[PDB]
Structures are given as structure tokens and as C-alpha cells.
């Protein structure tokens, strides 16, 4: 009986925290009548027809979302995909010619005074020597005034060269599931009180994560995943000014966004084979693009956020909101990706309110910009081709990236201001309840066995 | 029954050590991004499984799931009763309990298997 | 460590120019950006400049003030000109978010001590 | 006869002669043909390793020719043994179990688990 | 202890003492050192798998020491027993038989097949 | 000296119009030509 | 082409010639305008 | 002294030393590098 001897068990349910690399899992849709995608899913493996989730019991697994590596892996992957998709088509360097641009007043409206510009320039035809006088419409944001009819120049044309966004490909977000390879397990927390750093005694194993849309937005997350029960507040310090507060909504807020102008795209030849798509000859009236939210929905949503936020700051504290106070054009403004046209909206009609201890619509003006610098690494600009017709976008805007103000010692004058920065919180709100565990099947244990010879 | 990968990962070792095949069977599931990227993960998974299988085979083992062995427990790594260990603790707690003394255990198992092979050779050659 | 060391403070006659500068190290000045403070007696805190990474743009709250950098040297130069009687305060250089998030209003971490401009 | 996959036309009993012959050639061994070859190598290694793991899940550990429990249910086949072993070729035989393999691959597993549990209990009670 | 390949020059009998340590690190482990390092990893995997298949279908799989049939033909080496094991080294032994160690790999296969034949027949008879 | 094991007693249903080699080779030759046309002259200035 | 000339400021007899004070036209950031830039090129990197 | 064929007139003789020989050398000249514009985005540094 004394011969308590060591035995070895293989395939034992034991995991240790580790890091690895995952891959695609996208809905097939038969992938036949498709016009390709910027996150090319033809090379992505197909997802399971019926993914299975195994609930685990007796288990309290430590979770953490701020030193998670899944977000960094996601960011590297999407940046690599974006760079890969921009190679095999037009590489328009010959567009830094001295543009000669005037105003446009084909029955313009006063709010959009200026903005659009009639640009004309010399341009090389298919032949290397002959030149043609071509014209286009360029937004005020994409042209700067050199030689201060004035002479304008593309904004990107001293510091980078733009590869025009590929006309065949599309930026339409589609869900992608990240599935760990064999030997690794994906742990997902189902606790409704989950907030980030802290154990979650409801962890369940999944084949891989649910469908997540790699959307790009700033200071207002769009098509996120809502947290039930109540609006949740997550941070890495609720008491630090320089840290964002990834607020997640529970009731989706409908937001429409339009562009009530036609856009007659007119491809023009700039060299052998290379064709550059430009605007021109807006049909009908020209009015600035706008976005609509509902004041009844937004006021209630901000009230709920304030009620949940006063928990961490006291029940006798004022709570004020304000717009962004400065920064780039991609942080102080909304940063849509709506149907291949990159909006930049005036999110200052929402964040203007004060809350104390005790049908209609809000219209945000938007400034369309074509020449963008997404994935803000310098020297990787891209020209989004114009899209014909009037476009519309609908979203649930389930998120918020407010930063605290603070600094005035101890007082009750708390103000919150939206602000983005590093492009990681649009996925840290989607991969917060996920972790990768390396399974260790080997394990020794003592029994009464004797190992018969 | 209670199937599914890591289905009994929270249950005690008494009932956990019935479906180790579930935890061991899916260890071999299955230039652009999602290309060589997936292949690297595939190679890593094959590497890890091969490491585990060779580690099992080096000792006197590799029947499959359970493998009784020589070199008695030192009784210093865990001064705990057998019944309590096998019916009152989950596997992860055991892992964190004896995660400090693994390499010596593996070396002891290797030496025990080699000595067993030598004894078998000596008892087979003379007759 | 990251702390910032500032230099160039002093006395200036109305209608001149300055060359405020500040340097720092700490193996972590690739994720942050560097901007400047402005605190006059009796008033709250404002901002004067913020050199945003990820865009290379030299945002400033007024036209006169301009932020600049030079190569890989970890030093930042605030150039101010056409100074006037109100621009007498305690100028501090601090670290703002990676993309120069809300400033002229925020109170950052990893801030300096601050020179004096009269 | 001889040679890799040289007995697919022979009878079932006679074809169980060159199992080693067919088992040996399961592991033969940037730019075009430089990533396809490596992908094929990885796929072949993965297929062989999965097959070996599936074999080892049941208690064989010796590959060629294995004895096991889970008796032959008459529903799967209703015919004499010598007829099976004397006239069929292996390809013809695989047709009869094209759809009955999934249940067998779990029946053998549960039989192996039962045998392992009995072995462990017998060794523990001693 | 004598590390990996440490007993390379030791005598044959003493060299057959640390097989495990030298059988333990046979699986250690875009731009340069990308696809090529992965190629090295895959090559190591394939080599180990081929060696294991040989230690398999031969009839063994317990690795290290392995009893087997096919009595030692005198033509391969007409020498004493002790002289092989006391004053010879494994490298010298490998030089001694380098062209002979290809028919042996077939004699072992045929012996394994006939042993499996005998075991299967005696088991099925009763 | 490649080996050719003649098999007897075996019948197999072939298909020439659904083969996969005839398509993989078709893509492979195009890949070969695209690779072999990269590392030398790419004359644009002949459009004069 | 380089409208280069030979440098004679604080020069030493051993380093005669060598450095050359080259001036050439160059496209600016706009691909429509010529600057007039200058540089120093050693005699080992310029031929006549 | 190492050589593939020490009795040959076309094989290098890789002499390997026992004690190192300290050698310094400098370029006793400031070289002010000025950046100029190749075109859109690209820059070229030339000694001024
Ligand atoms: C957040 O999710 C919504 C919902 O998918 C996104 O709105 C979608 O926007 C695309 C782009 O315009 C729409 O596709 C287009 O539909 C029209 C009309 O059917 C069609 O003519 C076009 O060819 C194109 O297929 C899509 O319909 C629309 N979704 C819905 C439900 O209407 C939105 O873009 C997402 N947010 C961001 C920032 O991307
Ligand atoms: C983003 O949205 C805010 C929302 O207020 C914009 O702020 C407003 O911008 C206008 C620009 O003209 C400011 O000037 C005002 O113009 C009217 C036109 O008659 C004039 O009557 C007023 O006396 C005033 O001069 C205006 O003060 C300012 N604030 C408000 C509350 O209207 C802002 O311009 C938008 N864009 C950006 C980039 O911030
Ligand atoms: C396109 O090229 C023509 C070349 O003829 C440019 O024409 C010049 O126009 C300016 C004023 O518009 C005149 O002063 C020049 O004399 C013209 N050049 C001639 C006649 O050779 C035209 O400006 C170009 N378009 C632009 C730059 O937008
Ligand atoms: C969260 O923030 C707090 C404060 O915002 C950090 O603690 C501070 O650490 C600095 C380091 O020098 C001290 O100077 C401060 O005095 C500390 N604050 C307080 C209130 O004592 C803390 O490191 C951050 N991280 C975590 C995990 O709390
Ligand atoms: C933008 O500029 C173009 C080019 O000048 C304008 O098109 C001209 O329109 C006038 C009549 O208004 C015609 O006589 C010219 O022949 C047109 N030129 C070309 C090249 O088509 C255009 O009207 C301007 N405005 C808009 C809104 O496009
Ligand atoms: C945030 O809102 C304030 C006002 O509510 C804006 O301040 C105005 O900005 C415009 C243009 O920048 C000036 O013409 C006005 O004089 C400013 N008025 C005041 C009272 O400050 C501010 O621009 C908004 N910021 C953003 C990013 O939208
Ligand atoms: C740069 O371009 C100018 C353009 O005029 C060139 O100047 C001409 O040079 C030729 C000789 O190469 C002379 O015959 C002309 O008289 C010059 N024209 C003028 C207006 O000066 C110049 O040579 C080019 N190269 C350099 C180095 O400046
Ligand atoms: C023309 O556009 C410029 C923008 O640079 C603007 O300042 C000017 O007022 C515009 N002219 C008219 C008549 O609108
Ligand atoms: C050149 O681009 C820079 C951005 O680095 C910008 O500040 C400037 O206004 C542009 N134009 C110049 C320098 O003439
Ligand atoms: C998350 O909740 C846990 C619960 O104890 C708490 O300890 C932790 O500080 C919270 N993290 C936050 C609020 O960022
Ligand atoms: C855009 O052009 C089409 C085609 O003429 C027209 O039917 C449509 O009404 C135009 N857009 C708007 C908003 O009127
Ligand atoms: C947005 O609201 C304005 C308010 O009048 C309305 O004119 C416009 O049509 C709305 N756009 C929508 C609903 O897309
Ligand atoms: C957004 O547009 C949809 C469709 O036209 C409409 O049902 C919804 O009421 C709109 N939302 C708001 C806030 O107006
Ligand atoms: C709506 O927003 C205002 C803004 O201050 C706030 O005072 C009010 O309490 C909110 N709720 C209602 C029902 O008006
Ligand atoms: C912002 O709020 C203040 C008071 O809450 C109000 O007077 C002002 O009109 C509001 N402005 C906007 C643009 O909502
Ligand atoms: C937006 O909210 C609606 C509300 O039920 C939901 O059905 C939809 O799936 C959400 N997402 C999108 C992309 O519309
Ligand atoms: C969780 O632990 C309790 C503790 O007694 C146990 O009764 C229960 O069965 C466990 N849940 C499982 C194993 O699913
Ligand atoms: C093993 O883990 C750490 C490693 O140093 C050690 O401090 C700890 O005491 C050991 N475990 C136990 C249970 O003593
Ligand atoms: C084919 O079948 C015949 C008997 O019908 C047999 O004699 C012959 O050996 C078989 N072929 C082979 C290759 O075994
Ligand atoms: C080498 O050979 C000598 C005798 O020639 C022996 O004493 C020694 O033990 C051998 N080396 C080793 C490592 O056994
Ligand atoms: C500069 O001086 C050297 C010294 O002999 C001379 O050979 C060379 O030709 C000179 N360069 C020119 C452009 O004359
Ligand atoms: C190295 O030494 C051996 C010793 O016999 C000699 O044969 C050979 O020529 C030498 N090689 C040289 C000196 O390059
Ligand atoms: C070395 O050089 C001698 C000089 O004649 C020559 O005869 C001999 O063939 C050479 N051997 C080799 C291996 O190069
Ligand atoms: C080179 O110039 C720098 C300043 O531009 C000066 O500090 C240095 O002393 C000069 N070099 C020498 C060798 O004096």
C-alpha cells in the first residue's frame, strides 16, 4: 500500500497562458458572385458550419484585455492585408502637376462655400510625349495653395506618393473569425459583470471567436457588439487622464449618413494602361454630406452612460461633456468608412451637455475627404476613387472612446471629451473577452500502481 | 455524454481521467497573409504534438492514456492524501501545485526506463 | 525615466522671438507625442503646441507658435514669435497621446517642471 | 507481386502480404515550385501523423495487422468469411464500408477505453 | 552526465548506455530566416518521422534497445562478440558495415511480416 | 530509372475532361512566365 | 548631366582634384518644376 | 598559414595572426549632408 508511485497521464485537461498565431474563418456565401475583398477571404479557410461552444464549470480563469496580444496580432494582420491589397494596380505618381483650380458655383449652397474646387491641369496621355488639358473636382481638404486663378497642389505630393485605391476591390466590412491552431484553445468569458482585468468564473471554451467586423472609426465605434444588462465601462485606470474609457452601449443607436450629390466618375488616362478615376460635373444641386442621429435616443443613451459613470466618480459629482479640443483631422472628427468614401464628421452636436446630481434629429455636418492616410504610418497614403450616385449608411454606433479631463486637483468639475489616437480600441472592444491558452497534455500524478515488469 | 474539447476541464481528476481521448484527439485538427501564416501554425502544432509523443515514448510508456511507472514519488513534492488528491482537486490546481519539480521527474522517468531496458536485456541474453 | 527636461526660458522684450526646447529619453518615447503647456497666474491650463506622431503635423493653438523636430534626435523645439504682453507664463513640455489627442484642455502624465517666460 | 501499391488487384487474403510495402512510401523525401513542394510536404506529414494518432488511439501500437474487440455486426456484412478473404480485392471491399466506417472508428475507441480502464482497475486493486 | 553526442567516442558497450539523451533532441525547435528556417524545421520533422516509421513497421516501437529476429549472417562480419562491444566505437562499426545495412532493412521487414502471420493465425485458430 | 508497377485485375474509371493536373499545370505555366518576366527590362518609353 | 567644377577652398596639395563641386537640375516635389541643386562628388564617382 | 594548395601560384594564403595590429583611421572633415527632393516623397542626401 505504501508504493504510491508516479504515473503519467496524456491528453489531460490542463492549460497554460501562451501566445500563438491564428487565421481566418469567414462565411463562404459560395464565394462565386463576389468582386474580391480588401481582406481577401479566398485564401481564408472556411468557418465551421456549426461552431460548438463547450461550457466549463468549477473554473475561475484569470482574464485581462489590456496586455492581450490578440489585439496586436489583429492590428498587424489588418495592416498587412491593407498593404498587400494596394500593390497590384495603379500607382499614380504623375498627379503632382501644378493644378490650376477655381471655385465651383453651379448653384452651390452657402454652407459648402468653397470646399469643392474645379481643378484643371496638363496630363500625359497614353503616349509619353503628348499632353492633354484635363479637369476634375477636388475637395478643399486634398489641395493646398502653393505660390502664395491660384495654383493648387495635391496635399500628399511633397511627403509621399499615393497608390489609388483599387477600383475592383471593396472596403465593405465582413465578419472574420480568428481560430487558434491545433493544441491551442480559445477561452471566452460569458459573465455579464465582466469589465477587463479580473477573473471571470463563467469561462467557456470555443472553437474560435464570433464574427467580428474590422471596422475603422474614431471616437464613435460603429457596428460593435453590445453588452447586455447595462452599459459597461472599461479602462486601465479609471483614474488616469491619458487613458481612454471604452464605453460600450447596451441599446443600439441608429445613425443614418448620406451624401445628396451625384458623382459622375470620369476615368482619364495618365499613362500606358494606368487609368485614374476622378470626379466632375455634379448633376443637380450640391449639398454637404450629413449624418442624422435621434435626439430622443441619444439623450437617453448619454443619461445611461452618465448614471453608470457616476459609480466610479461619486454620486455627488457633476458630469459634463465637450467635443474634442484639438488634434489631427482623424481624432477630432468621426472617421467613417462608408461604401468606399471616407467621411469626416462634426461630432460636436452630441457631446455638448452637463449632468447634475439630481421625433427630432441631431445633424452632424461631414467633410468628405478622398486623399487619406489611414494606418497612419507615414508614406502610405491612398487615393479613394469617387463613387457614383447618392450613398447612404446605417449603423448602430455602439461604442465610445471618451477620455477624461482631470488635473484640477480634487473638485467636482469632471468633463469628458472624445478622442481616439492609436488604432487599437476598435478591436479591444471586440477581443476583450477572449484569450488563447496552450494546452499541456502531459501530467504526472501518484497512484498505487506498480508497473508490472 | 459530457463530450466536447476540455469538457471536464473543471471536474475532479477522478472523472476527468475518463475522457482524456477527447482532449488528445483534436491535437492534429485539419505568400499572402493567411497563407504561410496558417502553415507556420500547422508546423508548430505538429512540432508540439511530436514533442509530447516522443516524451511519452522515451519513458516506458506510450500505451496511450495512462501509463504506470517506476521511480516512486519522493513524497516531498506533495504531502497530501491519495483520496483527497484524486477526488478533491481539479487538474489545474494540481499543475500549479507541482509545476516546480517537473524536470527532475522527467529525468527520473528516463533513467528508470533505461534501467528497465538494461534489466530486460540482461534477463533475456543469459537464457 | 521618461521625464522631460526643458530649457530656453528667460526674459523677452515685446515683439521678439524665442527658441524654447526640451529633451527626454526613457526607452518609451516612440508611443507618445510631445507638446507644451501654458499656465498664467489666475487662469487655468491651456496648450500651445502638440507635434503629433502618425501624421507629422505641427498643430498649434495660435499661428505664431510652432513645434518642430529634427531627425532622430529626441529634442523638440518650440519656436514662438511676435510675442505680446499676455504671453508671460510658466511653459512646460509634456507628453500627449500618440495622435495628439484632446489638448489645450487635458492634463497629461509624464510632465516636466516648466521654465519661466516673462 | 512486388513494388509500391503492387497488389491492389490481388485477393483480400493475398493482398495482406505487402502492408510494409505500402506503408513505406507514405513518407517519401519565395518562388514557384518552392512553396508548393513545402506545402505538399507539410500536408503529407500531417496526414500520416493524424493517421498514426488515430491508429494509436485504439490499442494497436504496432500498425500492420491489429486485433480488437467490437465484434462484426451482421448488418455491416452478411456473407461467409472465406468468400471475403478469397475473391474480393481491397478496392471492392472498401465499397461495402464506404459509409459504415464512422461508427466503427468510435466503437473501437470506446472498446479501447474500456480495456484501458479495466487494466488500470486491475493493477490498482492489487 | 555526458551531454548530447557526448559518448560518441566511448566504447560500444558504454555508448549503448545514454541512448535516451541523444534521442531526446531530434526535434529541437518572407524574409531570410523565414521560409528557410521553416524548411529546416520541416526537414527535421520528416527525418524523425521516417526514423520512427522504420523503428515501427520493423516491429519495435519501444525504441532504444529492441530485440529482434533475423540471426546475424556471418558474411556481414566474421568476428568475435566481445571485440565488437569492448574495443570498438559506434563510428568504427558504422564504417565496418555501410553497404550491408540495406539488405538487413528488408530481412527485418520479412521477419516482422512472418511473425505477424504466426501471431494472427494462432490467435484466430483459438 | 523511374519505376512502373503494372497492375493487373484492376479497372479504374478515368476522366480526361475533369482532370486537375490539366488545370494546375495551366495556372503553373502562367506563374512561371510571370516570375521569369520580372527581373529584367520593363520598357515603358516606347509609346512615343 | 553635371555642370561640375573643381573645388579650391582650403584645399591641400595631397587632395588635389578629388572633391568636385557639382551643380545639376532636379525635379522638385511637383513633377513639373526644375530646381538647381548642388552637391560634392568625389573624383571616383564622376566621369567625363 | 593556411592554403588549399600551398605549392600553387593561384591559391590565396590566409595568414592568421597571433597578436592583433591596432589600426586607426578617420575622415578629418565635417561633411554637412543636405537633403534634396528626388520627386514626390523620395529624398536624396548629398554632402554639402
Ligand atoms: C456598419 O454596418 C452597416 C450595415 O452593414 C454598414 O452599412 C452598409 O453599407 C454598405 C455600403 O454602402 C451597403 O452596401 C451597399 O448597399 C447598396 C444598397 O443595397 C448597394 O447598392 C451597394 O452596391 C452596396 O452593396 C450596405 O447595404 C449597408 N448595410 C445595410 C444594412 O444597409 C456600414 O457601412 C457599417 N459601418 C461602416 C463604418 O462601414
Ligand atoms: C464643428 O461643429 C461646431 C458646432 O458648433 C462648429 O462650431 C461653429 O463654427 C462656426 C463657424 O462659422 C462658428 O462661427 C459662427 O458662425 C455663425 C454664422 O453666422 C455666426 O453667426 C456666429 O456668431 C459664429 O461666428 C461658431 O461660433 C461655432 N460654434 C457654434 C456653437 O456655432 C465647428 O465650426 C465645426 N467644425 C469644426 C472644424 O470644429
Ligand atoms: C497646360 O499646358 C499648357 C501648355 O501650352 C499651358 O499653357 C500656358 O498657359 C499660361 C497661362 O494659362 C500661359 O502664360 C502660357 O504661355 C501657356 N503656355 C504656352 C502657350 O505654351 C497651361 O497653363 C497648362 N495648364 C495648367 C498648367 O493648368
Ligand atoms: C494607474 O494610475 C495610477 C495613478 O494615475 C498609477 O499610480 C501612480 O504611479 C505614479 C508613478 O510615479 C506615481 O507618481 C503616482 O503617485 C501614482 N498615483 C497614485 C494615486 O498614487 C498607476 O501606476 C496606474 N496603473 C495601475 C495599474 O494602477
Ligand atoms: C469646371 O471646369 C470645366 C472646365 O473648364 C468646365 O467645363 C467647361 O464648361 C464651359 C461652359 O460652362 C464650356 O464652354 C467648356 O468647354 C467646358 N470645358 C470642358 C473641358 O469641358 C465646367 O463647367 C466647370 N464646372 C463644373 C461644375 O464642372
Ligand atoms: C468644439 O466646439 C467649439 C464651440 O462649441 C468650437 O469652437 C469654435 O471653433 C470655431 C472653428 O474652430 C471658431 O470659429 C469659433 O470661434 C469657436 N468658438 C468657441 C466658442 O470656441 C470648436 O472648434 C469645436 N471643435 C471641434 C473639433 O469640433
Ligand atoms: C538647367 O536648366 C536650364 C534651363 O534653361 C539650363 O539653362 C540653359 O543651359 C543651356 C546649356 O546647357 C544654355 O545654352 C541655355 O542658354 C540655358 N538657358 C537659360 C535660360 O539659362 C541649364 O543648363 C540646366 N542645367 C544647369 C546645371 O543649370
Ligand atoms: C474661392 O475659394 C477660396 C478658397 O481658397 C475662397 O477663399 C474664396 O472666397 C472663394 N471665392 C468665392 C467667390 O466663393
Ligand atoms: C509639404 O508637406 C508638409 C508636411 O510634412 C507640409 O507641412 C507643408 O505645408 C507642405 N508644403 C510645403 C513645405 O511647401
Ligand atoms: C474590474 O473589476 C474588478 C473586480 O474586483 C476590479 O478589481 C478591477 O479594478 C476592475 N477594473 C477596472 C474597473 O478597470
Ligand atoms: C443621379 O443620376 C441619376 C441618373 O440620371 C438620377 O436618376 C438621380 O436622380 C441622380 N441623383 C439624384 C440624387 O437625383
Ligand atoms: C437628416 O435630417 C435632415 C433634417 O431635415 C433631413 O433633411 C435629411 O433628409 C435627413 N437625412 C436622412 C434621414 O438620411
Ligand atoms: C435612419 O433611417 C432609417 C431608414 O430610412 C429610418 O428607419 C430611421 O428612423 C432613421 N433614423 C433616424 C434617427 O432618423
Ligand atoms: C436630456 O438632455 C438634457 C441636456 O442637459 C438633460 O438636462 C435632460 O435631463 C435629459 N433628459 C430629458 C428627459 O430631457
Ligand atoms: C451647447 O450647449 C449649450 C448649453 O448646454 C447651448 O447653449 C448651446 O446652444 C449648445 N450648442 C450646440 C451646438 O449644441
Ligand atoms: C444594428 O442593430 C440592429 C437592431 O436590431 C440589428 O438587427 C443589426 O444586426 C445591427 N447591426 C447592423 C450591422 O445593422
Ligand atoms: C462544481 O463544484 C461543485 C463542488 O462540489 C461540484 O459539486 C459540481 O459538480 C462542480 N460542477 C461541475 C463538475 O460541473
Ligand atoms: C515553485 O515556484 C516558484 C518558482 O521559484 C517557487 O517560488 C515556489 O515556492 C515553488 N512552488 C512551491 C509550491 O513551493
Ligand atoms: C487476377 O485474378 C486471377 C484469378 O482470377 C489470379 O490468378 C491473378 O493472380 C490475379 N492477378 C494478380 C495480379 O494477382
Ligand atoms: C578512450 O579510450 C581509453 C583507452 O584507449 C579509455 O581509457 C577511455 O575511457 C576512453 N574514453 C572514454 C570517454 O571512455
Ligand atoms: C581641378 O584640378 C585638377 C588638378 O590637376 C585638374 O586636373 C582638374 O581638371 C580640375 N578640374 C577642372 C574642372 O578643371
Ligand atoms: C595540414 O597538415 C597536414 C598534416 O599532414 C598536411 O598533410 C597538409 O598538407 C597541411 N595543409 C596545409 C599546410 O595547408
Ligand atoms: C596541388 O598543386 C600541385 C602543383 O603542381 C599539383 O601537382 C597538384 O595536382 C595540386 N593538387 C590539388 C588537389 O590541387
Ligand atoms: C565640425 O562642426 C561642428 C559644428 O558644426 C563642430 O562642433 C566640430 O568641432 C567640427 N569638427 C571639428 C573636427 O572641429
Author numbering:
A (entry chain A): 31 to 141, 150 to 186, 188 to 309, 312 to 321, 321A, 322 to 398, 411 to 505
B (entry chain B): 518 to 547, 568 to 664
C (entry chain J): 1 to 52, 55 to 82, 82A, 82B, 82C, 83 to 100, 100A, 100B, ...
D (entry chain D), E (entry chain F): 519 to 547, 568 to 664
F (entry chain C): 80 to 127
G (entry chain E): 128 to 141, 150 to 183
H (entry chain E): 272 to 309, 312 to 321
Quote the passages of the study that discuss this structure, keeping the authors' original sentences.
Broadly neutralizing antibodies are proposed as therapeutic and prophylactic agents against HIV‐1, but their potency and breadth are less than optimal. This study describes the immunization of a llama with the prefusion‐stabilized HIV‐1 envelope (Env) trimer, BG505 DS‐SOSIP, and the identification and improvement of potent neutralizing nanobodies recognizing the CD4‐binding site (CD4bs) of vulnerability. Cryo‐EM structures of these nanobodies in complex with Env trimer revealed the two nanobodies to neutralize HIV‐1 by mimicking the recognition of the CD4 receptor.
To further improve the potency and breadth, we attached the two CD4bs‐targeting nanobodies, G36 and R27, to the N‐terminus of the light chain of a V2‐apex‐targeting broadly neutralizing antibody CAP256V2LS, creating human‐llama bispecific antibodies. We were unable to obtain a cryo‐EM structure for CAP256L‐R27×3 bound to BG505 DS‐SOSIP due to antibody‐induced aggregation but did succeed in determining a cryo‐EM structure for CAP256L‐R27 bound to BG505 DS‐SOSIP. This structure revealed a single CAP256V2LS Fab to bind at the V2‐apex and three copies of R27 each to bind to a CD4bs of the trimer. Even though the cryo‐EM density for the linker between R27 and CAP256 light chain was disordered, one of the bound R27s could be identified by its proximity to link with the light chain of CAP256 that bound to the V2‐apex, and the other two R27s were from separate CAP256L‐R27 molecules. While CAP256L‐G36×3LS was not better than CAP256L‐G36LS, both CAP256L‐R27×3LS and CAP256L‐J3×3LS substantially improved neutralizing potency, with CAP256L‐R27×3LS being the most potent (geometric mean IC50 = 0.004 µg mL−1).
